[model samples]
Target: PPCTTEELSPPPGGSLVEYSGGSLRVPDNPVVAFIRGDGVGPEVVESALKVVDAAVKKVYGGSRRIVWWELLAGHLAREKCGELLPKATLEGIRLARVALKGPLETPVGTGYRSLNVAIRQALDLYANIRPVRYYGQPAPHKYADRVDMVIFRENTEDVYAGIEWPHDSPEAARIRRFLAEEFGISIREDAGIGVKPISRFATRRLMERALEWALRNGNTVVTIMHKGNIMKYTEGAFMRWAYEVALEKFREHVVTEQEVQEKYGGVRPEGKILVNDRIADNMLQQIITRPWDYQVIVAPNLNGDYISDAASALVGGIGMAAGMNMGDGIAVAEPVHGTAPKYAGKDLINPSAEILSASLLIGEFMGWREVKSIVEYAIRKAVQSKKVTQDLARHMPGVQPLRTSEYTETLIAYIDEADLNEVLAGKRG
Candidate 1:
């Protein structure tokens, strides 16, 4: 079924981009599908679109531009088309192969399951990547500058799979009865049940991508975080499979913690990745107290979700977080922050995450190095000037915050005026 909004249309002249054989094939004027999402989603997305468009224009002059295709999803989809996620939206993303989205609301314990999770599962988007790094923005955390991490979360598996039976539901009773009858195991009748599945294939693929990212980005460690001590089979298998992939596919480049301790007295050798595992509980403490000790983290879905947000908190908050979800051929970039219904249409919230998310789409997915550099520098420039949104402004004394519209204007001006080499030099010096 199509989105009921008559004004929403696909780009007329652009070609659909495709991801094949491990690389994206993009055209000069490629169409990009976008979902404005729910609550404050529209405001933040609009702010992001302005900066992204300006960066592209500044980098390419008038020769190249992204042809945006507006697709309907979330509350707008429910209002206009009687569905939260329309088939047309999914098909549009399938055709475009890359999407940039804002936060879509997911009602807890009622209504629909998370629309974000649903879309990822529907598209088989198994890898959720969140890059956490300090933008040097003044914020609540004192150690923001010391935090930098890349989280590769296994998206399609674990408790997030939504395979749960409510407490006292007939389905729960039936499943519990089956377990008791077949295996002589007893479960409390009133208990709710949810299945957690971690597979060898998913674990290996996630670890491979995480290792590849660490090598590409010059990161020193790749920690496999898990609660394997308790959930031995599921979480333990996850840790084991990751190590197996490291030993099998990346043997030459990686050194396990055990090998480092045994052979080199716990000092990692040069030019070798320090692949290690951390129990989830200890990892929480280590991230805060010994923040620099970890780099790239690969984890099962639940751990990744929690760990990513925690890492984001070190830099600023989820308002400064950028995220991307990927499968074999398609990808979508989005902010880790959720839709804030209270901030809807007020132009009050920080759009930094959304703006940086667009950088991921424009730079990483579309392969525009100059535009990416320009966008990033613009953000750093804005934050450094003490002109920012409510989130960052609240933390800075004697600094007045700008509305979302004004912030967009500030970013566009920076993108136009800042020289690439000068920006790079200033950052380095």
Candidate 2:
């Protein structure tokens, strides 16, 4: 009963009034919930919000705004409702239809509930989208411009479905005993077991989403990443369905160069949209060696959970990792990083992850190009000058460190100045 799915309908949010100067113009300022997660969650969240508000203020005098409604969840939820993820928090997510969250803690032991998993299942936030990219300014990476990919992970199921038995649990006992009795094989008594379920319905829906996004973005490829060789039926079926969906719906929008060659033989235009597949293990090497060859990746839950994080490392740490968990007619955009409980209240966390995520949300809803530019400029300037939180400072070479609030101040100051490209490029250093 705890894992039962919740019904999701198109959000009944009211229409926007208008938008100008990169500021939204809705009849009523949309009151979106903010779960400033646990620990260092609040520090980075506050910094992110400060920059978001500044962007809105500078672009639109007093027009569109986010009426912040603080929601109690995670550690705070336990205090308010004696539960990690309270019903009130779920309702808040439903009411707002979209939200920005700071990471919450999920300890690695027993008894406690998974606050993130509960919310995702209850809300039916099925597709997890993580966009990974690099910037040359501020803290630079060797593969800064060479890397750019959006990982589409099925959020609702897969190994993360949590149907697992601890080493000595009843289910593990039954499975091991059955194997021994039926096939004369004895397994370790202390081994853990988890079920991975990949349904056709789940597979096609996620792959469809990736293909749709590819068409929308004019991207050439959507690679299906999976370890199907081992989990044959489940992960393999995902790959099979993905190719079918590509051929079924997006026949005109994209096609693999190999497919074209097999049918019509090689010759093609300067640019073409293609669909492909790669075994999850091989993809690890492929992403690092030739990231540019892939545009979008559709993968199962477990593979995605790992791949996205690995890809993020290629560009930067989780600070710039952004994601959008979407379903039929609803979405919740937030950073992919977790709540760093160790850094709570220290003002030493990065807010760029959440800030960039917010930009993606607004850009998708309304073409707020100028507002997005302002926020991005601020982030780039903050990092380029090395005025950053400890997350970046950990890897930054000879950089002055600042508290979270100070970093936000730098963001606002740069936004006001508005020449972020040149400023970050050291043109105005």
- Mark the regions of model 1 whose C-alpha exceeds 4 Å error after superposition: 1-13, 60-64, 78-82, 107-113, 170-184, 261-270, 422-429
The CA-based lDDT of model 1 is what?
0.84
Looking at model 2, residue 153 earns an lDDT score of 95
Q: How high is each candidate's TM-score?
A: 0.89, 0.81
Pick by TM-score: which candidate is best?
1
lDDT on C-alpha atoms for all candidate structures:
0.84, 0.72
As for model 1, its CA RMSD to the true structure in angstroms is 3.3
Clashing pairs in 1: none
Model 1: weakest 10-residue lDDT segment is 420-429
Candidate 2 residue-wise lDDT, 1-429, digit = tens: 011114312224433234356334434366556777787777777776788778767666557666666676667767755677767677666666656777778856843436776677788889998888765443234665677788999887887777888988888999999989999978899899778899888888888878777755557778999988988999998888888877787677667657778865675543456787899999988988788888799999988988898888777755678777876545567787777667677777777887877766554433344566678767766777878877778778777788878888888888876754543342110
